[PDB]
Amino acid sequence: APIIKLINAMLGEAIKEGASDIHIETFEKTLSIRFRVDGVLREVLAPSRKLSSLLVSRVKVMAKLDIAEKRVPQDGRISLAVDVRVSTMPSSHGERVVMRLLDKDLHSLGMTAH
Amino acid sequence: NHDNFRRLIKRPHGIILVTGPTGSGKSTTLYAGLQELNSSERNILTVEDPIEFDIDGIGQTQVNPRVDMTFARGLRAILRQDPDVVMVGEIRDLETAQIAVQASLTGHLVMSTLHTNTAVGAVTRLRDMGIEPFLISSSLLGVLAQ
């Protein structure tokens, strides 16, 4: 579908710009896409508001989450070598999606010599 | 008072509480604070019970008992959306306060309310629920008795 390509190209654009988080947020009038490229939030695209439900649905099925359940928070995973952690949550104008993009010695980690 | 509140709500992290009795206009003060912060450079999200009105540009989740979506679970969900500032309706119990204290220490600016008669009553109230006396000193930026 056209929506499947849009989410895939958006993820490619997120890796292009060096984004850590992708923020899909639905308001009453507008739908907004934002990346947090290096800790700074950024406007990237404001598509048609009608697409809200389809973008939420596509990102759910990629992370193997419930499509029809729009009343509780759902957290899932995807492997594209980019490991993403999607997190959906209920709101006033539908769900709000955020997917954190993470790339895939014991002493260096923290342990002392003893 | 505005300039002092401005600087406090514009800090990168910490808890700011607004206290007083019922019908003291706490929400109105919080809503005014969020609207002042409402910029394109920050991600602001809220958990409310119920949502008083809609701020355009700010995310606002409602406490839904039909799906067991509580303040604690709602606040725990908001923290996974990569927020800069968070506004909790009110911290009624220990579990919700524990998450708000962790939120404040972990780089988020937290905002909430408590039904206490004095500004010291808010610091008081956090000590009562079971927040370690220390954790209040590190996280708390200020209290607004209104």
8-state DSSP, B11: S
Pair A13, A28: CB distance under 8 Å? no
The resolution, in Å, is 4.2
Q: Which of these, A92, A93, A31, A32, lies nearest to B48 by C-alpha position?
A: A92
SS3 helix, strand, coil % of chain A, rounded to 5? 30, 35, 35
Torsion of CA B51, B55, B58, B59, to 10 degrees: 30
Q: Would you state the structure tokens that stand for residue A16, as one six-digit string?
A: 């292009």
| CA pair distance B99, B17, nearest whole angstrom | 15
| CA pair distance A75, A96, nearest whole angstrom | 12
Q: How far is CA B24 from CA A44, B3, B146, in A?
A: 41, 21, 6
8-state DSSP, B133: H
Q: Closest residue of A to B65, CA-based?
A: A71
Interchain contact B12–A (C-beta under 8 A): no
Pair B52, B138: CB distance under 8 Å? no
Torsion of CA B46, B52, B54, B55, to 10 degrees: -60
| Cα within 13 Å of Cα(B55), Cβ side | 25
The 3-state DSSP class for residue B67 equals coil
Interchain contact B78–A (C-beta under 8 A): yes
Q: How far is CA A2 from CA A51, A55, A58, A79, in A?
A: 11, 11, 11, 21
Bridge partners (DSSP) of residue A63 are: none
- For B86, left (φ over 0), alpha (ψ -120 to 50), or beta? beta
Pair A34, A49: CB distance under 8 Å? no
Interchain contact B52–A (C-beta under 8 A): no
Distance from CA of B44 to the nearest CA of A (A): 11
Q: Which residue among B59, B67, B77 places its CB closest to the CB of A25? A: B59
| CA pair distance B91, B113, nearest whole angstrom | 7
Interchain contact B38–A (C-beta under 8 A): no
Cα A100–Cα B86–Cα B27 angle in degrees, nearest 5: 155
Q: How far is CA B16 from CA A15, B7, B44, in A?
A: 36, 11, 15
The phi, psi pair for A15, rounded to 5°, reads -75, -35
Q: Would you state the structure tokens that stand for residue A2, as one six-digit string?
A: 């056209």
